Amino acid sequence: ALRFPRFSQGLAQDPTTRRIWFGIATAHDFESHDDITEGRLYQNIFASHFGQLAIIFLWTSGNLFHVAWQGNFEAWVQDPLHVRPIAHAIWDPHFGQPAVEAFTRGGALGPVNIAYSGVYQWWYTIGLRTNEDLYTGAIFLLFLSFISLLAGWLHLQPKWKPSVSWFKNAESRLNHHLSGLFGVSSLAWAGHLVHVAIPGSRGEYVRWNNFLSVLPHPQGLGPLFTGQWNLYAQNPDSSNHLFSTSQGAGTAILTLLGGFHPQTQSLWLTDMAHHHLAIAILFLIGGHMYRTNFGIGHSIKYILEAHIPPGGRLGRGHKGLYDTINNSIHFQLGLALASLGVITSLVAQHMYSLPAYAFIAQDFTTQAALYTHHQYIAGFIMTGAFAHGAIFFIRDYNPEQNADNVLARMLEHKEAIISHLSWASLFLGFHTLGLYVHNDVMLAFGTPEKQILIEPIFAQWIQSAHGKTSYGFDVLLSSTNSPALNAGRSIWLPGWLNAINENSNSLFLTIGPGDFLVHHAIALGLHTTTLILVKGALDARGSKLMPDKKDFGYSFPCDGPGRGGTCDISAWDAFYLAVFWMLNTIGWVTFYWHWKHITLWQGNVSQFNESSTYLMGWLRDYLWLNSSQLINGYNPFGMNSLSVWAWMFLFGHLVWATGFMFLISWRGYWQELIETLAWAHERTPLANLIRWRDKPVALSIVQARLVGLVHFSVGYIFTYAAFLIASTSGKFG
Amino acid sequence: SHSVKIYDTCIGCTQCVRACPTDVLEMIPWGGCKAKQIASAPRTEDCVGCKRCESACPTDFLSVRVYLWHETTRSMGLAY
Amino acid sequence: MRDLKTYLSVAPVASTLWFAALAGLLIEINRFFPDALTFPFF
Amino acid sequence: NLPSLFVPLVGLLFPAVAMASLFLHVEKRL
Amino acid sequence: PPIGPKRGAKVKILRQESYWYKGTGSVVAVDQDPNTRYPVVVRFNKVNYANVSTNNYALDEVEEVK
Amino acid sequence: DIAGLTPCKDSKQFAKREKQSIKKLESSLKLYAPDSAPALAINATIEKTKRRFDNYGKQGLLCGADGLPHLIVSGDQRHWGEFITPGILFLYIAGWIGWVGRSYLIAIRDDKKPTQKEIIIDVPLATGLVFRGFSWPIAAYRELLNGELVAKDV
Amino acid sequence: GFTPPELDPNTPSPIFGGSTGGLLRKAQVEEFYVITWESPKEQIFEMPTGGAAIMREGPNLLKLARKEQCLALGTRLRSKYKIKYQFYRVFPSGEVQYLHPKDGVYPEKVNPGRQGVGVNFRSIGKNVSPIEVKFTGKQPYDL
Ligand code: CLA
Ligand code: CLA
Ligand code: CLA
Numbered sequence A: 001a002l003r004f005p006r007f008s009q010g011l012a013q014d015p016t017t018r019r020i021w022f023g024i025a026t027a028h029d030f031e032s033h034d035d036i037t038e039g040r041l042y043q044n045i046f047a048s049h050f051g052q053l054a055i056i057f058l059w060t061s062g063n064l065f066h067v068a069w070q071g072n073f074e075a076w077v078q079d080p081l082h083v084r085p086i087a088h089a090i091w092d093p094h095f096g097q098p099a100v101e102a103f104t105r106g107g108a109l110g111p112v113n114i115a116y117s118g119v120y121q122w123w124y125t126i127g128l129r130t131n132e133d134l135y136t137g138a139i140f141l142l143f144l145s146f147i148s149l150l151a152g153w154l155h156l157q158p159k160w161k162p163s164v165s166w167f168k169n170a171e172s173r174l175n176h177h178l179s180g181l182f183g184v185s186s187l188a189w190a191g192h193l194v195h196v197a198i199p200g201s202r203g204e205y206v207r208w209n210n211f212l213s214v215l216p217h218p219q220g221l222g223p224l225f226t227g228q229w230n231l232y233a234q235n236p237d238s239s240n241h242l243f244s245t246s247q248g249a250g251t252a253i254l255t256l257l258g259g260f261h262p263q264t265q266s267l268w269l270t271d272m273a274h275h276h277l278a279i280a281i282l283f284l285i286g287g288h289m290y291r292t293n294f295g296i297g298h299s300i301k302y303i304l305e306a307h308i309p310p311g312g313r314l315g316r317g318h319k320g321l322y323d324t325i326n327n328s329i330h331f332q333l334g335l336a337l338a339s340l341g342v343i344t345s346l347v348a349q350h351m352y353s354l355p356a357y358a359f360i361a362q363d364f365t366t367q368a369a370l371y372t373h374h375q376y377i378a379g380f381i382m383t384g385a386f387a388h389g390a391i392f393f394i395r396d397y398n399p400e401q402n403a404d405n406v407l408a409r410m411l412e413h414k415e416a417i418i419s420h421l422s423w424a425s426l427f428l429g430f431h432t433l434g435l436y437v438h439n440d441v442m443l444a445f446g447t448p449e450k451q452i453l454i455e456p457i458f459a460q461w462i463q464s465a466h467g468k469t470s471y472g473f474d475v476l477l478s479s480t481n482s483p484a485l486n487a488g489r490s491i492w493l494p495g496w497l498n499a500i501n502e503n504s505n506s507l508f509l510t511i512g513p514g515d516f517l518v519h520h521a522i523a524l525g526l527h528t529t530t531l532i533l534v535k536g537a538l539d540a541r542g543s544k545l546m547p548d549k550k551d552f553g554y555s556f557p558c559d560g561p562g563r564g565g566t567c568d569i570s571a572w573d574a575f576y577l578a579v580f581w582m583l584n585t586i587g588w589v590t591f592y593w594h595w596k597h598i599t600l601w602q603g604n605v606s607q608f609n610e611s612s613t614y615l616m617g618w619l620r621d622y623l624w625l626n627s628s629q630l631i632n633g634y635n636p637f638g639m640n641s642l643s644v645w646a647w648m649f650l651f652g653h654l655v656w657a658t659g660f661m662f663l664i665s666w667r668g669y670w671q672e673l674i675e676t677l678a679w680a681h682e683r684t685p686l687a688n689l690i691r692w693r694d695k696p697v698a699l700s701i702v703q704a705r706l707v708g709l710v711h712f713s714v715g716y717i718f719t720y721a722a723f724l725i726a727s728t729s730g731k732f733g
Numbered sequence B: 001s002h003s004v005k006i007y008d009t010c011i012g013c014t015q016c017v018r019a020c021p022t023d024v025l026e027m028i029p030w031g032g033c034k035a036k037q038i039a040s041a042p043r044t045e046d047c048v049g050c051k052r053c054e055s056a057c058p059t060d061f062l063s064v065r066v067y068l069w070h071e072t073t074r075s076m077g078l079a080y
Numbered sequence C: 001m002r003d004l005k006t007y008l009s010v011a012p013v014a015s016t017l018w019f020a021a022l023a024g025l026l027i028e029i030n031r032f033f034p035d036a037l038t039f040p041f042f
Numbered sequence D: 001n002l003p004s005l006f007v008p009l010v011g012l013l014f015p016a017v018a019m020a021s022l023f024l025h026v027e028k029r030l
Numbered sequence E: 001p002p003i004g005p006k007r008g009a010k011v012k013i014l015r016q017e018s019y020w021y022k023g024t025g026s027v028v029a030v031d032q033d034p035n036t037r038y039p040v041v042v043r044f045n046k047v048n049y050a051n052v053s054t055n056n057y058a059l060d061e062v063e064e065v066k
Numbered sequence F: 001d002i003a004g005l006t007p008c009k010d011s012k013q014f015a016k017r018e019k020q021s022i023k024k025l026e027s028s029l030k031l032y033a034p035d036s037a038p039a040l041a042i043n044a045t046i047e048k049t050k051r052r053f054d055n056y057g058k059q060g061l062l063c064g065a066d067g068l069p070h071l072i073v074s075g076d077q078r079h080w081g082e083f084i085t086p087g088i089l090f091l092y093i094a095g096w097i098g099w100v101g102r103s104y105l106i107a108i109r110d111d112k113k114p115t116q117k118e119i120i121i122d123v124p125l126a127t128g129l130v131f132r133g134f135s136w137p138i139a140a141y142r143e144l145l146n147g148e149l150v151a152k153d154v
Numbered sequence G: 001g002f003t004p005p006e007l008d009p010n011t012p013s014p015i016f017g018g019s020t021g022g023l024l025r026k027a028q029v030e031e032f033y034v035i036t037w038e039s040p041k042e043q044i045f046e047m048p049t050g051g052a053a054i055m056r057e058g059p060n061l062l063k064l065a066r067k068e069q070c071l072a073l074g075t076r077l078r079s080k081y082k083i084k085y086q087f088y089r090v091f092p093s094g095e096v097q098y099l100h101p102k103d104g105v106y107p108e109k110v111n112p113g114r115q116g117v118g119v120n121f122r123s124i125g126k127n128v129s130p131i132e133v134k135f136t137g138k139q140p141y142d143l
């Protein structure tokens, strides 16, 4: 110990500046710290979880506070489609007078930023109506962040810290998460919708003062205990209904209409309340599967032991997988990040196609910002899922306790998995690029008719299968005779078919050959990013080049210039290489989404359908064309409110290019340069009276890869966020 | 300082000791191989981690292994 | 002579001759059958 | 009026105190 | 008695960290001197990552395959 | 027709592209003399444009709203000339290339220096093997049934 | 049995005009090194720190900042010229520590008075998986 970092003696005894960097970069790697035990490991993780929850509650609390203080929420409720919501107020003493003038918008007294997170529509749809309601929620979350820190501190003293056996109680944890954390929370949310949100959506302001007096339904509760639940679905709202008023209001609380509210263009609030209630009670029954202290339930160990196919095509099946995952926190985090990244992308794909918050589909800047945000979030989460999968193989995988099960068999034929992932990436890359270049050459020579435009007929057939008419393939939901259509005409199909064939929303947009080419670029990005992460995770314990890689850990610089050269041979470097492909993949995904919508919102879908089939169209008719108002955020003749993006736009270009220095130039050059600088300081008068207490050295090789990747990613995200919002909000459509 | 280890697969060709630029390796008598000698790392406090010894080992797999550990003034190659 | 023929069999020279013959053939095919997005002979 | 007090308190005074205190702790010896 | 396989026979390399693991090579000399933990000398068709074509292995590290 | 497309012989945008392309070439033609070599070149390009558009419309190509031939690769028998038929032709050629190269590598694998015949091609051996790809789907299929295509235990 | 030669100060140093690659404050407060050799005549030799110096005839003493600089110069003294060499470490207290050649024999030549340090008696691939040393201060190669 003796000095920073107190958890690593070898870092503390470093005489150079490297002591500080590695002390920061390894603060949360509890397993590498000195004198760590399984108890201290789970306990520090437990308290870190509480601290995170406190962070999240405090963050949401602050968001409510500024919307209620400097925001537009009360004025925005009156005009949902004519009021620009306010994020907070701007107080920058570097502002010139015109900067104050151009940034004063949304109907405020001083300069303000226009919020683009969608919390206004979210809070209006759930029942919040006045700034006082937002102040109440902020105090509650500030108080919740307080008790989160309280519980985190509480379980760090003896007799409150639990044993590692308590953390390894998987059966009880799953039952409670499915029953309580998943189901009871969804059940209570359905309760909030049917008490406050739905009546709030009909003109009735239900709050804590009067929620005990009002009835959510005229004949409340009674039918629920009888079985005549259909009385809760009798009188929905008319298709000619105004959200904050009562003209067209009904009295139903649980419906299955299937479409959108025609005015708000968001999902039916009764449908959402019924949805949460149905999935909740489904989670409640499902949360009674595993065995606890009552003599009934399953042993997850025994279920895994019993799933072994005779004939031995999977060897010993899943035997030993229970303890393999229950003892490895990296395995559990890998599964958690994998599932979370999938449902994060699921949220992205559904919030733009099935908007659930009132008056959010018309806020085009908000829809673009939200989809881009979650897709990059999900991309990072997926890279982390595979990163911790490799970390599990190195730090926790016991080959003898996983003998001849499915997990060890993955390693047994690692070459087959990696080679075929390589073939699929090569196939997709060769052909997708080739077709794009072919069409580029055709349009260069002025012969558009010679392009190769393949019709995405399989996804078109699926859209017709959902009842879309634009392609006329006459399958179920699109054909009058299929039983899939007859069984649903009574319920969701009227509203569903009404919404899918509306040419304004984005519920299953019309797709053409341009969409076929972009989706194959997406397949290339997914396959190659998967290839990088899987090859690194399977070759993490060893390779023909370095058969003892597991002894060197997860993150090390290299193995030297011997044996031909072993640069970027660790699994950490595999992650580091895959993040570039993740950013490239999400870049393709979001370039696709933003261009299709920004042409749809402009009513010019033909420009996308005709220009997305060749890459010169992407450079010219998407990036170059939409950058106009952005780059003119400030010109030699003045500026407007888009200047903050024109600046951030260039800011992102700088950080990104700065990362190239850390990624192209490597260490030894900078070490010799620092040596020539240390001599300069020791031989300079006056200044040599100042002595450094940490020896200046060049950044570590792994540190350089990390710093270069962080600059690359920060520039990536900030450059695109600036262009996205400025090109969309500059038009607002 | 960096850790250096010698495994008994060593054939005793004395190549790791010749390539070492800070005199960390030694050749001690042994009875396992034909040259009657094996390598040892008694002065890893001077080891810089160049892995120039591993580049010269003819054994498959290596018989010298340099596991980069806690950095010191000597291991970082500082003249200042 | 035998050494000259052995030089002509080296990888770059064999590649150039092979790819030149291939390039000329595809050029004449697209010269007698230009454009063609499909296989029209069915 | 409150921004005229808290914006410098978090962009000037807070990083000043934070960077100075972290410097003393990082450079401290035992 | 000659310990180990005869010289020239094909051997399946069973050392997991070897460049020729699960592959096959040919025997050169079997050192009959005990206390030698790696007597079997094998020569290989293809060079490893160190441009080396011969290596020494133990008796339980080589399997005779025809 | 299929996927809402209209055949290019029926599409107006398809015929308007042919018109505008030919009229654009004619606009370049008025600048030069009727006996000029650029004139005969532009006239040949116009005739080549008419031939291209007519051939696309004659062989049943489907056109979108953009007046450009869209290809249908679902396997519909009305458009096998757009993918499946040229794809089978490709797979025949690709298998030929791979099978001949494989036959070459097998023939030289027992040489004293197999690397010698990989950087200096044995053209006589190559010329004798290039025509075995003509029957590659047969020779490969038999090697599949006899266990000669895949190396045992690798 | 071998007895290391003690470092004799006032030993002549090669002729050199001075360079910027010499000692720094590390030599004053941390440590520095000193290499000694005999040499037959006055010669020119490239300095591991800067340019060229004139190796004096008879005993020579040269103070450097790093150990690797000493062994590199010694190796060239043993290759280009045919000169034996020793070098030591000098702490700021004045203490001297003999380094190389340790036994008086060069390290590439086997010597019977040497003991094994860090010699594992198994194949390199016979190390254990990292999970078997988890929560311990051990490594799979220290054993
Ligand atoms: C994580 C939530 C959060 C976030 C991101 C922000 C962000 C911002 N706030 Mg704010 N604030 C918050 C919570 C938050 N606040 C809470 C809970 C309160 C009490 C109700 C306030 C009260 C407040 C006032 C009065 C003002 C701001 C202002 C501002 C802006 C200027 C920066 C500043 O003065 O720092 C924030 C200053 C504070 C006093 C907030 C810190 C106190 C709370 C309890 C957070 C706890 C801090 C703790 C010591 C360390 C947190 C750990 C880590 C998460 C940072 C800025 C955009 C100024 C502004 O409007 O700019 C024009 C301003 O006038 N805030
Ligand atoms: C994030 C917080 C923050 C804040 C609140 C400010 C605030 C300010 N900046 Mg600054 N700046 C910042 C970050 C910040 N900056 C960063 C990160 C950079 C690096 C890019 C800069 C670079 C920068 C430059 C180059 C300049 C400013 C200037 C200014 C001042 C211009 C407005 C003015 O005319 O006032 C009044 C102008 C005065 C001269 C009065 C000075 C105010 C008194 C003397 C403050 C007293 C200081 C106090 C005693 C001790 C403070 C430190 C203490 C907390 C330890 C203003 C007070 C300008 C400036 O300072 O003018 C010379 C200017 O030249 N800033
Ligand atoms: C709930 C999710 C989760 C959790 C609990 C963990 C937990 C852990 N991770 Mg992990 N990871 C995750 C997700 C997660 N990760 C994801 C999504 C990715 C993909 C990006 C990764 C990729 C990853 C790698 C490559 C590594 C880990 C490692 C680790 C372990 C040590 C981390 C550490 O102490 O370093 C401390 C972390 C920091 C000090 C963060 C500093 C760097 C950040 C990104 C810079 C901030 C960006 C920028 C400056 C701010 C914005 C700019 C501004 C201008 C606005 C630890 C147990 C490390 C490990 O121990 O391997 C065995 C390891 O090398 N993770």
Ligand code: CLA
Pocket: A045, A046, A049, A050, A053, A166, A167, A169, A170, A172, A173, A176, A177, A179, A180, A181, A182, A185
């Ligand atoms: C019914 C009893 C119960 C309940 C309610 C909980 C609840 C919780 N436990 Mg716990 N636990 C229990 C019993 C219970 N536990 C028992 C009996 C044991 C002993 C075996 C444990 C042992 C245990 C451990 C070891 C840990 C927890 C942890 C947690 C927290 C998980 C992190 C989180 O908040 O994510 C929230 C999850 C949800 C909100 C539901 C899922 C979210 C879905 C998938 C997506 C979001 C839905 C929707 C689309 C969101 C819309 C977005 C919009 C609202 C903005 C959570 C609050 C962690 C913790 O302590 O953190 C401090 C943890 O480390 N528990």
Ligand code: CLA
Pocket: A419, A420, A422, A423, A426, F097, F098, F099, F100, F101, F102, F104, F121, F126, F129
């Ligand atoms: C006889 C030559 C030959 C053959 C039969 C194969 C066969 C195969 N390769 Mg391959 N390859 C070759 C050459 C060859 N390759 C060369 C020269 C390179 C270096 C550019 C590669 C690089 C390569 C990669 C990176 C991959 C494969 C893969 C594969 C497998 C999947 C199919 C594929 O993707 O092919 C694709 C073919 C290419 C990408 C390049 C082929 C170039 C030409 C067409 C082949 C060379 C012909 C030769 C010069 C002719 C000699 C004539 C002789 C008679 C004198 C497959 C069994 C994939 C795999 O791992 O399987 C899962 C894979 O990832 N190959």
Ligand SMILES: CC1=C(/C=C/C(C)=C/C=C/C(C)=C/C=C/C=C(C)/C=C/C=C(C)/C=C/C2=C(C)CCCC2(C)C)C(C)(C)CCC1
Pocket: A330, A331, A334, A335, A338, A342, A385, A386, A388, A389, A390, A392, A393, A537
């Ligand atoms: C490396 C590793 C790892 C990691 C891994 C991962 C990361 C994985 C993943 C993955 C993923 C990321 C996945 C995904 C998925 C998904 C799926 C698998 C799905 C599905 C489904 C289906 C089948 C569907 C169906 C349907 C329905 C239901 C309805 C509608 C129609 C349809 C058809 C759509 C671990 C740690 C483990 C271990 C170690 C190693």
Ligand code: SF4
Pocket: A557, A558, A559, A560, A561, A565, A566, A567, A568, A666, A701
């Ligand atoms: S030190 Fe740098 S150049 Fe050398 S092997 Fe390692 S990563 Fe490659």
Ligand code: SF4
Pocket: B004, B016, B019, B020, B021, B022, B023, B024, B025, B046, B047, B048, B049, B050, B051, B052, B053, B054, B066
């Ligand atoms: S890594 Fe370099 S300094 Fe260390 S023992 Fe090997 S050769 Fe010597």
Ligand code: SF4
Pocket: B006, B009, B010, B011, B012, B013, B014, B015, B016, B017, B038, B039, B053, B056, B057, B058, B059, B062, B063, B064
């Ligand atoms: S290089 Fe390898 S085989 Fe040669 S003496 Fe050193 S450890 Fe032994």
